[PDB]
Amino acid sequence: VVKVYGPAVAVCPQRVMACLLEKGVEFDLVHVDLDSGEQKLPEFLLKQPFGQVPVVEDGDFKLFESRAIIRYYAAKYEDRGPNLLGNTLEEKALVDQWLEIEAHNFNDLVFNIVFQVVILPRIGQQGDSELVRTYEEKLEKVLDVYEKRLSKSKYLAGDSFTLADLSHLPATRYLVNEAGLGHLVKDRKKLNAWWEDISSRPAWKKLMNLAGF
Amino acid sequence: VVKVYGPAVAVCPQRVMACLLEKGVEFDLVHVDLDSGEQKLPEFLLKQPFGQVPVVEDGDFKLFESRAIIRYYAAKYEDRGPNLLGNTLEEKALVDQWLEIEAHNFNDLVFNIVFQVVILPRIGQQGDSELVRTYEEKLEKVLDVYEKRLSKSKYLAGDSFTLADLSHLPATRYLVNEAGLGHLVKDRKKLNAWWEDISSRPAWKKLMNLAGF
Ligand SMILES: Oc1cc(O)c2c(c1)O[C@@H](c1ccc(O)c(O)c1)[C@H](O)C2
Ligand SMILES: Oc1cc(O)c2c(c1)O[C@@H](c1ccc(O)c(O)c1)[C@H](O)C2
Ligand SMILES: N[C@@H](CCC(=O)N[C@@H](CS)C(=O)NCC(=O)O)C(=O)O
Ligand SMILES: N[C@@H](CCC(=O)N[C@@H](CS)C(=O)NCC(=O)O)C(=O)O
Ligand code: NA
Ligand code: NA
Ligand code: NA
Ligand code: NA
Ligand code: NA
Ligand code: NA
Ligand code: NA
Ligand code: NA
Ligand code: NA
Ligand code: NA
């Protein structure tokens, strides 16, 4: 049984768990207490040498980097559950393109925002609201590209749900709830409909029930 | 024949071209003048809607995000030239892990450094040396993990050269030349040997001959 390391509430562990749930892969969650810096101490650095979560252990196989992990499990269990990768090399490439868009254009801004608005106040530090503003204005321009895409295609990589969509679930939820920036999605009709669809999937609802969201 | 858009000198176009050269894929380079902001104007935004390079056009197939592109061509031409992906799903996962390490842990720091040290002075702006210092200190800690890995494995993802190594070529060259931070590699014996190996590959030398490096 796969072991997943990290808090249930954290974005990158959730990305992994969402894929495992979609693919029907049993796992055991091992909390790592990011609040207290457990991920930076020697025991955990033997598992993830950059001191970040998640890592997975699957027998004597060990893997980190959330987007590497979801690609691995989507392939290992391709012929079960939803096709998350695409079939043809061109379909697979479009999944990869929209993962790459998620991982930089989108997530660099969303993380920055959530870190200032949500993470830092929890440890007694004021966020930099002016900086958050700059991220918000960049993110509107990124999401205008999403809206254009979703006007043409039901999901990001084509007409079916894939890893590309899945990878957005955890951070987007924080963006539109805890960070108070739901307008970024609600202002964009196709994006809003996409969000209400993907975030209502049974695997995601199960994970949110576990996490308390 | 594949069309690749972007300057020959730029990092992400070079990442793509390195893969095409390794795989023996013919291409035509279409310069995009980043110096003058061509990538932000309407004509180019029809090709890459985030206003960045590269994009590839391969008949009526269009793809952007450099790491999506190199995965596509490594798969489309798997049975020719070097195996860049790995064979087993676990080998492929380790390639993906080290691509993910390149794409965030490594490249976020190297880009930041090169932007301040190299890009901004070329447009008449002083870089923020204090900020560059902070990046340099983070990057030493990242590269200590690389050194540990390369003590155990010839290349990053295993005993052979893969996409994981390839993806580092363009930015590392800037880091150790134009940015003046060659000590980051030279200080680390296994990393230095890895660098002198991968950057001497014939495909890379050909590309550097084209680019003027
Ligand atoms: O330093 C931290 C500590 C945390 O507990 C978390 C951190 C950073 O980042 C959060 C996070 C928030 C938003 C994102 O887009 C993202 O990639 C990660 C994570 O959920 C939880
Ligand atoms: O705004 C720019 C303009 C550019 O011409 C370049 C930019 C940014 O980034 C450079 C760059 C430099 C270092 C990197 O690690 C990286 O990912 C990209 C690129 O080579 C060339
Ligand atoms: N590129 C990594 C990012 C991992 C990451 O940022 N993890 C966060 C949780 S979402 C973390 O461990 N934060 C605490 C820290 O960085 O100290 C991946 O995708 O796995
Ligand atoms: N995530 C993108 C990054 C592309 C990117 O940053 N491209 C740079 C060149 S290396 C660019 O176009 N810079 C100019 C700009 O951002 O305006 C990819 O990997 O393709
Ligand atoms: Na990780
Ligand atoms: Na990340
Ligand atoms: Na304001
Ligand atoms: Na698009
Ligand atoms: Na919890
Ligand atoms: Na691109
Ligand atoms: Na990038
Ligand atoms: Na100093
Ligand atoms: Na390692
Ligand atoms: Na040139």
Side-chain angles (χ1 to χ4, degrees), chain B residues 48 52-54 64-66:
Chain B
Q48 215 285 21
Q52 300 187 316
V53 298
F64 58 92
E65 286 290 335
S66 66

Coordinates of all heavy atoms in Angstrom, one line a residue, chain B residues 48 52-54 64-66, ligand 10:
Chain B
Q48 N 1.2 31.7 -29.1 CA 1.5 31.4 -27.7 C 0.7 32.4 -26.9 O 1.1 33.6 -26.9 CB 3.0 31.4 -27.5 CG 3.4 30.3 -26.5 CD 3.1 30.7 -25.0 OE1 2.2 31.5 -24.7 NE2 3.8 30.1 -24.1
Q52 N 4.9 34.1 -24.6 CA 6.2 33.6 -24.3 C 6.7 32.6 -25.4 O 5.8 32.1 -26.2 CB 6.2 32.8 -23.0 CG 5.9 33.7 -21.8 CD 6.0 33.0 -20.5 OE1 5.7 31.8 -20.3 NE2 6.6 33.7 -19.6
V53 N 8.0 32.4 -25.5 CA 8.5 31.4 -26.5 C 9.1 30.2 -25.7 O 9.6 30.4 -24.6 CB 9.6 32.1 -27.4 CG1 9.0 33.2 -28.2 CG2 10.8 32.6 -26.6
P54 N 9.1 29.0 -26.2 CA 8.8 28.7 -27.6 C 7.4 28.2 -27.8 O 6.7 27.8 -26.9 CB 9.8 27.6 -27.9 CG 9.8 26.8 -26.6 CD 9.8 27.9 -25.6
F64 N 2.9 24.4 -27.1 CA 3.8 25.2 -26.4 C 4.0 24.6 -25.0 O 3.6 23.5 -24.7 CB 3.3 26.7 -26.4 CG 2.0 27.0 -25.8 CD1 1.8 27.3 -24.5 CD2 0.8 26.9 -26.6 CE1 0.6 27.6 -23.9 CE2 -0.4 27.2 -26.0 CZ -0.5 27.5 -24.6
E65 N 4.8 25.3 -24.2 CA 5.5 24.9 -22.9 C 6.6 24.0 -23.3 O 6.4 22.8 -23.7 CB 4.5 24.3 -21.9 CG 3.6 25.4 -21.3 CD 4.4 26.3 -20.3 OE1 5.4 25.8 -19.8 OE2 4.0 27.4 -20.1
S66 N 7.8 24.5 -23.1 CA 9.0 23.8 -23.5 C 9.1 22.3 -23.0 O 9.6 21.5 -23.7 CB 10.3 24.6 -23.1 OG 10.4 24.7 -21.7
Ligands
NA10 NA 6.1 28.0 -24.2

